[PDB]
Amino acid sequence: TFRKSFDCYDFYDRAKVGEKCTQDDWDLMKIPMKAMELKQKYGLDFKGEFIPTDKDMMEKLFKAGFEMLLECGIYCTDTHRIVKYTEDEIWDAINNVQKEFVLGTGRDAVNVRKRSVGDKAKPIVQGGPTGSPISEDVFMPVHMSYALEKEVDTIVNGVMTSVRGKSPIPKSPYEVLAAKTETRLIKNACAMAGRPGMGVXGPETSLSAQGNISADCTGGMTCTDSHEVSQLNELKIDLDAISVIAHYKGNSDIIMDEQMPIFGGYAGGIEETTIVDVATHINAVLMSSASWHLDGPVHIRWGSTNTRETLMIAGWACATISEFTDILSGNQYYPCAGPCTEMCLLEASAQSITDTASGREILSGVASAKGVVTDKTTGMEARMMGEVARATAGVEISEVNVILDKLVSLYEKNYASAPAGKTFQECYDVKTVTPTEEYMQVYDGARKKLEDLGLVF
Amino acid sequence: TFRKSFDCYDFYDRAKVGEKCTQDDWDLMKIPMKAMELKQKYGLDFKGEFIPTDKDMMEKLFKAGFEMLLECGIYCTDTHRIVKYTEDEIWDAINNVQKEFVLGTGRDAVNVRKRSVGDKAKPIVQGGPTGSPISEDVFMPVHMSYALEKEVDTIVNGVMTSVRGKSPIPKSPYEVLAAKTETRLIKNACAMAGRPGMGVXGPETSLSAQGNISADCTGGMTCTDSHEVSQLNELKIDLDAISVIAHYKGNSDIIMDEQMPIFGGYAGGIEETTIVDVATHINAVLMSSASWHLDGPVHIRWGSTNTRETLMIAGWACATISEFTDILSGNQYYPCAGPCTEMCLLEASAQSITDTASGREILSGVASAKGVVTDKTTGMEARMMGEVARATAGVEISEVNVILDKLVSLYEKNYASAPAGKTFQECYDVKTVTPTEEYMQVYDGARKKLEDLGLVF
Amino acid sequence: TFRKSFDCYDFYDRAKVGEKCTQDDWDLMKIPMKAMELKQKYGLDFKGEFIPTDKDMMEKLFKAGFEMLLECGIYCTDTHRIVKYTEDEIWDAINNVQKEFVLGTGRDAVNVRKRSVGDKAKPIVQGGPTGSPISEDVFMPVHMSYALEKEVDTIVNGVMTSVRGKSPIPKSPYEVLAAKTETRLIKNACAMAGRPGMGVXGPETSLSAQGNISADCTGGMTCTDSHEVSQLNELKIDLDAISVIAHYKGNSDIIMDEQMPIFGGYAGGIEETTIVDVATHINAVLMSSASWHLDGPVHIRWGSTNTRETLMIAGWACATISEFTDILSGNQYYPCAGPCTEMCLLEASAQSITDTASGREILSGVASAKGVVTDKTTGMEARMMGEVARATAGVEISEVNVILDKLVSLYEKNYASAPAGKTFQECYDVKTVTPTEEYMQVYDGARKKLEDLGLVF
Amino acid sequence: TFRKSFDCYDFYDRAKVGEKCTQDDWDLMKIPMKAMELKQKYGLDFKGEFIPTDKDMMEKLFKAGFEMLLECGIYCTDTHRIVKYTEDEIWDAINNVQKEFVLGTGRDAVNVRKRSVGDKAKPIVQGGPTGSPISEDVFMPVHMSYALEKEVDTIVNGVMTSVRGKSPIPKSPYEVLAAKTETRLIKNACAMAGRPGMGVXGPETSLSAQGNISADCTGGMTCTDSHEVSQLNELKIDLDAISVIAHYKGNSDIIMDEQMPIFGGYAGGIEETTIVDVATHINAVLMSSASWHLDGPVHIRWGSTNTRETLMIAGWACATISEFTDILSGNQYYPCAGPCTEMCLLEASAQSITDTASGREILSGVASAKGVVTDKTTGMEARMMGEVARATAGVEISEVNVILDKLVSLYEKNYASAPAGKTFQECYDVKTVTPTEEYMQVYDGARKKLEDLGLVF
């Protein structure tokens, strides 16, 4: 049996005396070799499906992911050493995951419970800038655009480009100020939308351990909000994250561990990246004591989470995790196109269909324009994400796979020419925080195309 | 109909003017006569089963238990009088029991909901010294050994052998100090294990009404913890308990009423003691306004809760209570053997199998070495209790009865020679609060034997 | 030096092994002998003064009181043993008393700070039934009559004659219910008077340790209220009080220790009883860890606190305690006459003059009709107590002594024929909680007599 | 006038673009040159006095300290640049300092208000290990030894040598665990001593910014506790401190800025080091937004705060700060000798006399054995610190200077041979947390010598 249930403290201990290894040995050899080995040994073949319907193949994928984590371990970037788990330690973690939890408070609180593949229940809609840069002068209005949408259940924080007119440079007092201020302003925005108790997910503006740790404060982040800790790529972590985890645990905070496996990255192709994805979903409840895990497979070239390959990775990973474990999870949205464009809405829709049908409990979006363009995220994208989730819930998986193939085909040949879209200030009337007629028309056009494909709103 | 829903105040009123009766008339005549009468009148025969599969027999057991309570009433030790209920008052209590509740707070909170016989859902694991005496200098470390186990959901408090180097003598200021300190230290231990919000069950160190009433305090016991009130043997109570109940109710505290029927005691044998057990489960929601009831059938000679007879009593009582009522319940663990011994683990395992399959919502253990030897309780026993519960959940009852017969046979001939075991300090590295390799090996050996019997972990 | 600062735990320890002694040996020998000895050794002679102006005599009184406590110790009624203090332990207590504190919360909170003899500052007016029996159906209205008076700062709780129509018998669940309910109802009354945050003093209805300990609860007593612990007569205590003290300390509650020395009692006459009074003021901060001490010298025959002798005892004790220590204190009011009578108002006035001029920080009244007649206490008596305190503040002590001699002479010959007065229901319009014109006229008459004596309102 | 009131954010801004300078240029040239220049320009000469009685000389010292800060600025170790203030910015800070504040909560809270030189009021006694290393297994008992002393008002935290048996290595998860655990355990200790609401000062175990920032937590440090930020030597700071300050401000925490100028250090001698001391008291309310400032002049060779030179530095700095500003301050205790030795008590006594008479509002001690020997700190040293403060309060300054000269002469020739003393476990009965008779005898001996010098307890 195991000595003790594994935690961040054991990780630190092992990271100091583990097997020495260069990062190149890890990225260019250990990880790709094992993923390649497991794919062939288990004969993994997704056969073009977005959501699996072959339980035998799913079970092999689960075993592959488990074995990947067990045999490789986790690389610590600060110590350049590898942390290894034992089989019994991994099972202790999987066998004792958080079953459910509540986000938010008061009338605005919501229950997060497990969803199965093709579940009739709708997933939780976590809407917001999704970590995208937002100008200080419109920080509240932008977030209000999500709180004002009944489709949205919780908020995923945007990043403050400045606080008191200064950049929140990591390890500067401005980073601490931004960490506390970010959620204080967002909850104020939610209150103005008549939903003071909405839960949030962050902290996003802070990047250092000290910055993230300062986020819990009166009026700001509290235990009923999702606290983010980020895993690196692939099966890798830094010590800052380990200390942040200790802090979240010590405050009884709901913990959201996230990992964004890269298709075409160190692991390799579709099946290989999915093996890694399953492994990181498991690592979330082991290393990070996560309450839930946020996925986000991204295309090495396009940098989007809704390409045919990344949707397949997410669909298989979640369906498998949902089938063999009780791990609560979600997926994050990175469309190529910007706001107020049909492509952006269709891209997010394809992912919402995939995430909903595959069994995700939480949908966290939408970081339009790949989340790197200031102010290019609005509540309209989250509204579509939510409506599509409602439409997808309960639909037969065979039908979903057909719809996805047709939908993805509508935009997968335009990644290089994805429309830049508009900023919040351009497609919304900032003063009243309402979308322009132009955006409403674009929304209708996209919705119509989805209906023609078979979706019933 | 009834005049008003029955409560502790009505009990006091009736206890002052009820039928006068000596305790011997109650213990040596009224109770044994009625149990004997009801067993024969309803033709109760468990036929060697640990968990019943005959609903007709179960219904007769329920009727017998109901009639036992209705015809006998409850003996008040302080007034030497009998309190009688009416049929309508008993039904009002049974028809309005607490459906579910939450224990603990923050990320560490857990939901307690009803479980049926053979339920696929796992019961709540309440781990701790289980009222056993613990040395002051290791009070926190010992409890930490349970909080560090992911298998454990809530903590059941141990007893402080001293506070500030003095015995917590009943009705002395030290008892009050211990009552408040006990949970304050335990929650501090839980915080050190990264689970600040774990719920607890107590107060254990205090024995008087004034001591128990002082336990609710800042940093200590709160409404999200289970508050203990103890019934006496059999169908008996003291006025101190009645005042404690009034206090718990007045603070909106979750109330845990407990009763430990004695096999071979005043009621008689197996079926007779089970009739009493059903009667006390019902009395819990009537006299104590209980949120849930904790059982604990004990062998008059061995003083253990896992003998063949006591397991049968618990299994039948719970299966029956689960079938005909919505009363939430749990069972407490008293193995003969001490920590770091295979017998202790096997004894607790047999009870975990019985409790899980019979429908218990909460498992409260483990008071190793019969809970009377200082420091002889560790988190390892709770880990086994939890793993076995997971393995038992969902298993066919016919298979469970077969496994139990084989398992109990492995130790039921060694009660008189049960190994004393070791103290926490002997089988754990106190500084890091981790089990020794010796204990881990013992654990593996016991687990292996359970697997050979058919359990799948 | 001392081993450790003395507390209730040390008291318990010593009470179990102290010198064995019968209560008669204590009451009829040890106490009277020492008081007699110290009076003569220090040549104490108050020469008819109510408030001392001779600092030399005051210093001797302080030394006498200190020596009384040091040489006699405290008799424990439950163990029939004597607890002895060392000189260094007593000084450690006196040298570290609470300097000030806040009662109540929000806008209604008040600061309690030290007052000197003849201080210009007005003492805190704690008004209420002062432990007198109040009918359940008018419990809130009666207390509202005090909260509605701007003269009143905090409330001193009355006793519920019944709760849910039943007597709060000690050690019954009704006592617990009354302990919590008492303050919950009183604070509700204060809220109806537009002062939700008024602090209170109790618990009064409960008599047992378990009853008093149950009083701290949501909506009821909290740390910003004065928590009562009662010393016995004379230099005596029971173990119940010791456990209650441990509870108050463990909850960070403001503690009010009280003692009511009896003139003509076991100690003897005026100077003798004052020596005991000084000794019990000191014992309050030693044995009870008191935040403040409530006095209440009472006449062995008349049972009142405003006789010439009892006023002199209180005046000298407080002036002396104020001069040589920083101990915060108050005095309680027990007039012979009942409500709506001129005598009652004049009796309370004489005590308010004495308490204010002698340096009391808190005035706790008024228990009209000696506090033993149901519903015979109203806010009008507290209004007079407050107005008189304002008028007395800052007045030259020589003038105060003259006024007191004249005032006490107006009623000291009518103790045996003191008017019974009226109940709240008779001298107030219960529906609007306002005094009758009859009472207002009586009040005016009494006020006029006080003005003729020299008081300026 | 100034652009805006100066804060940590402005500091960061200026530290990035300030004048480049090596640390040697700062320590070996800029600082010593300016201190030397100002000493001569203002003709500072303390003439052997511990506490000044020459207001003209004090005013020149204040001007010197102000000019030192204005002309030199503050060196930032991370950017190797100098931050400069304007005269108007410094005055804005001095003219708007915190007037008073409350530490702790409930009955145990205490008010911190300004004290003048020779003030009759006693300073606040902050007792504890004073940052000294304490073994994990006695962490609570050791702190309880201070809470049990009525002389102690608040607690100054010790350092955990281990948490869960592991060293709290900076930037490891163990540091975060220790930061939260430290105060949680200490407040638990205070609760066991019957003072749950005692305020504390920390966090001490954590050294990194992330570690210190994690200290605010439920059950741990809160806004009513003093939050420590440390200045470097001399007129120097690191960016970690700047971020910690932003965090404390963002949580509305009471901030305690500390600086320990070194006699014989970079500034030079007595007057030179005092000029720096005044400058850092001022910098506290400017750079750190301090609520109060903790001083601690230390001897470059002896490493103690109670040498003749360091006592003079503290006395003059505080008397001057008290005379010309409303800045609240305290001093920290580092005796050469260890616990249970007469020298340790006499050393701490000399500092308590100096601090009390010079006007300090808070006394923070005692870090016996120079605070570097595990477990060598006990509540007995804090008791002496408190008793001596009481004895010193109100004494004529001329008399104090005479007493100090005689007292310091009793040990200043034995620094090299200062007795090592004993650990808590050796001079206390750990189980009951009470001093041994041996320690009590040592205490009496030291007290007797102080009385012979003129102190009246």
Nearest CA in chain B to C184: B250
Cross-strand pairs, B166: B163
Longest dimension (CA), chain C: 63
- Please state, in angstroms and rounded to a whole number, the distance separating the CA atoms of residues B221 and B226: 9
Alpha-carbon gap, residue B421 to B418, rounded angstroms: 9
Chains A and D touch (3+ CB pairs under 8 A): yes
Of A3, A5, A255, the CB nearest to B150: A5
Closest partner residue to D184 (CB to CB) among B191, B218, B432 is B191
From chain B, the residues in CB contact with A7 under 8 A are: 194
Map tokens 């990344």 to a residue.
A310
- D318 closest CA partner among D376, D350, D352, D361: D361
Angle D177-D179-D184 from CA coordinates, rounded to 5°: 90
| Whether B105 contacts chain D with CB within 8 A | no
Of residues D262, D317, D352, the one with CA closest to residue D51? D317
Q: What are the structure tokens assigned to B378, written together?
A: 């560790």
The residue among D304, D310, D414 whose CA lies nearest residue D370 is D304
DSSP notation for A119-161: -SSPPEEEES-TT-EE-GGGHHHHHHHHHT-TT--EEE--EES
Joined together, the tokens standing for residue B152 give: 């454990």
Q: In this complex, is the C-beta atom of A7 within 8 Å of any C-beta atom belonging to chain B?
A: yes
B430 to chain D nearest CA, in Å?
8
**Which residues of C fall within a CB distance of 8 Å from B180?**
247, 250-251
- Chain D environment of C100 (Cβ under 8 Å): 111
CB atoms within 10 A of CB A198: 29
How many angstroms separate the Cα of B37 from the Cα of each of B32, B44, B263, B297, C34?
8, 11, 17, 21, 70
Residue B82 in 3-state DSSP?
strand
Specify the DSSP class assigned to residue B7: -
Q: Does any CB of chain D come closer than 8 Å to the CB of residue A213?
A: yes
> How far is the C-alpha of B15 from the C-alpha of B76, rounded, in Å?
6
Helix (H, G, I), strand (E, B) or coil at A164: coil
Q: Does C176 touch chain B (CB under 8 A)?
A: yes
Q: φ and ψ at D6, to 5 degrees? A: -65, 140
Q: Residue type at C179?
A: A
Chains A and C touch (3+ CB pairs under 8 A): no
Chain D: residue nearest C246 by CA?
D194
In Å, what is the CA distance from C269 to each residue of A446, C32, C299, D172? 99, 10, 10, 71
Residues B359, B116 contacting (CB under 8 angstroms): yes
How far apart (Å, rounded) are the C-alpha atoms in residues A115 and A99?
11
Using alpha carbons, select from B62, B76, B59, B69 the residue that is nearest to residue B18: B76
Comparing CA positions, the residue from A51, A119, A117, A45 lying closest to residue A405 is A51
Which of C8, C166, C210 has its CB closest to that of B210? C210
**Do residues B9 and B246 touch, judged by C-beta distance below 8 A?**
yes
Q: Which residue of C has its CA nearest to B239?
A: C172
Eight-class DSSP state of A26:
I
- Reading the block at residue A132, the tokens are 């995208």
Structure tokens, D143: 């702190």
- C12 touching chain B per CB within 8 A: yes
D299 and D260 in contact (C-beta within 8 Å)? no
| Tally of residues, chain D | 457
Please report residues of D whose CB lies closer than 8 A to that of C291: 107
* Yes or no, beta carbons of D184 and B162 under 8 Å apart: no
Q: Which helix (H) or strand (E) holds B349?
A: helix B342-358
3-state secondary structure chain D: CCCCCCCHHHHHHHHHHCEECCHHHHHHHHHHHHHHHHHHHCCCCCCCCCCCCCHHHHHHHHHHHHHHHHHHCEEECCCCEEECCCHHHHHHHHCCCCCEEEECCHHHCEEEECCCCCCCCCCEEEECCCCCEECHHHHHHHHHHHHCCCCCCEEECCEECCECCECCCCCCHHHHHHHHHHHHHHHHHHHHCCCCCCCEEECCCCCCHHHHHCCECCCCECCCCEEEEECECCCEECHHHHHHHHHHHHCCCEEEEECCCEECCCCCCHHHHHHHHHHHHHHHHHHCCCCEEEECCEECCCCCCCCHHHHHHHHHHHHHHHHHCCCCEEEECCCCCCCCCHHHHHHHHHHHHHHHHHCCCEEEECCCHHHCCCCCCCHHHHHHHHHHHHHHCCCCHHHHHHHHHHHHHCCCCCCCCCCCCCCHHHHEECCCCEECHHHHHHHHHHHHHHHHHCCCC
Here the tokens at position C246 are: 């441990």
Question: Residue B432 carries which side chain, given as an amino acid letter?
Answer: T
What is the C-alpha separation between C425 and C339, in angstroms, rounded?
Answer: 11
* Closest C-alpha to C85, from C72, C70, C75: C70
C202 φ/ψ angles, rounded to the nearest 5 degrees = -175, -160
Give the one of A5, A99, A101 whose C-beta lies nearest to B148's C-beta: A5
Contacts of A101 (CB under 8 A, 6+ apart): A111, A112, A254, A291, A292, A328, B107
Q: How far apart are CA A265 and CA B43, in angstroms?
A: 72
Question: Which residues in chain C have their CB less than 8 angstroms from residue B210's CB?
Answer: 208-210, 213, 240, 243
User: Which CATH number belongs to the domain containing residue B179 in this structure?
Assistant: 3.20.20.460
Bridge partners of A82, per DSSP, are A19, A75
- Angle of CA points D336, D381, D401, to nearest 5°: 70
Residue B266: strand, helix, or coil = coil
Q: Which residues contact A261 (CB under 8 A, 6 or more apart)?
A: A233, A234, A267, A273, A274, A276, A277, A280, A295, A296, A297, A298, A313
In single-letter form, the type of residue at position C449 comes to: K
| Upper half-sphere CA count for residue D1 (Cβ side, 13 Å) | 4
Q: Are strands B100-103 and B110-113 parallel, antiparallel or unpaired?
A: antiparallel
Pairwise CA distance, residues C198 & C104, whole Å: 5
3-state secondary structure of C173: helix
Q: To the nearest 10°, report the CA torsion of A300, A303, A309, A313.
A: 90
Q: Which of C447, C401, C364 is nearest to C124 (CA)?
A: C364
Q: B226: left (phi > 0), else alpha (psi -120 to 50), else beta?
A: beta
The Cα–Cα gap between A374 and A423 comes to 7
- Rounded distance, CA A366 to CA A388, Å? 13
The nearest alpha carbon in chain D to B429 belongs to: D165
Which helix (H) or strand (E) segment holds residue B20: the answer is: strand B19-20
Supply C115's token pair.
């007052």
Look at D251 and A12 and tell me if their CB atoms are within 8 Å.
no
CB neighbours (10 Å) of residue C279? 31
Taking the C-alpha atoms of residue B359 and residue B329, their distance in angstroms, rounded to an integer, is 9
**CB C275, CB C321: distance < 8 Å:** no
Look up residue A221 and give its DSSP letter.
B
User: Does the CB of D137 have a partner CB in chain B at under 8 Å?
Assistant: yes
Chain C residue with minimal CA distance to B245?
Answer: C173
Q: Is B440 on the interface with A (CB under 8 A)?
A: yes
Domain count within chain A: 1
C103 chain-D contacts, CB cut-off 8 A: none
Least Cα separation, residue B192 to chain D (angstroms): 7
* Residues of the domain holding A78: 1-457
The number of C-beta contacts closer than 8 angstroms across B and D is 55
Q: Do the chains contact at D106 and C249, CB–CB below 8 Å?
A: no
Q: What is the DSSP secondary structure assignment for residue A329, as one 8-state letter?
A: E
Q: Which of residues 408-437 of D touch B (CB under 8 A)?
A: 429, 431-433
List, in sequence order, the alpha helices (H) in B148-238: 173-192, 209-213
User: Cα-atom radius of gyration of chain C, to the nearest Å?
Assistant: 21
B194: nearest CB among A1, A93, A289: A289
Distance CA C160, CA C175 (A): 10
Touch between D and B (at least 3 CB pairs under 8 Å): yes
CB neighbours of residue B456 within 10 Å: 9
DSSP A337: S
Of D73, D7, D33, residue with least CA distance to D257: D7
Overall residue count recorded for chain B in this entry: 457
Give how far B207 is from chain A: nearest CA, Å: 32
Q: Which residues pair with B126 in a beta bridge?
A: B154, B364
B105, B107, B432: best to mutate for the A interface, most A CBs within 10 A = B107
Instruction: Return the residues preceding each gap in chain A, C–N over 2.5 A, or none.
Output: none
Q: Which of B191, B196, B434 sits opposite A4 (nearest CB)?
A: B434
Q: Note whether D438 and D426 are within 8 A (CB).
A: no
Which of A9, A210, A250 has the CB atom closest to D209's CB atom?
A: A210
- Smallest Cα distance from B173 to chain C, Å: 4
Q: Is C287 on the interface with B (CB under 8 A)?
A: no
Residue C75 phi/psi, 5-degree rounding, is: -85, 130
Tokens coding A396: 């037969």
**Tell me, what DSSP letter sits at residue A27?**
I
Longest dimension (CA), chain B: 63
Q: Among C444, C442, C411, C425, which Cα is nearest to C336's?
A: C411
Distance CA C442, CA C451 (A): 14
Measured in whole angstroms, the distance separating CA C272 from the mean position of its chain's CA atoms is 19
d(CA B120, CA A129): 40
Work out whether strand C200-202 and strand C226-230 pair parallel, antiparallel, or are unpaired: parallel
C218 touches chain B (CB under 8 A): yes
> Using CB atoms, which residue from D173, D218, D240 is nearest to A243?
D173
Question: Which amino acid is present at A359?
Answer: G
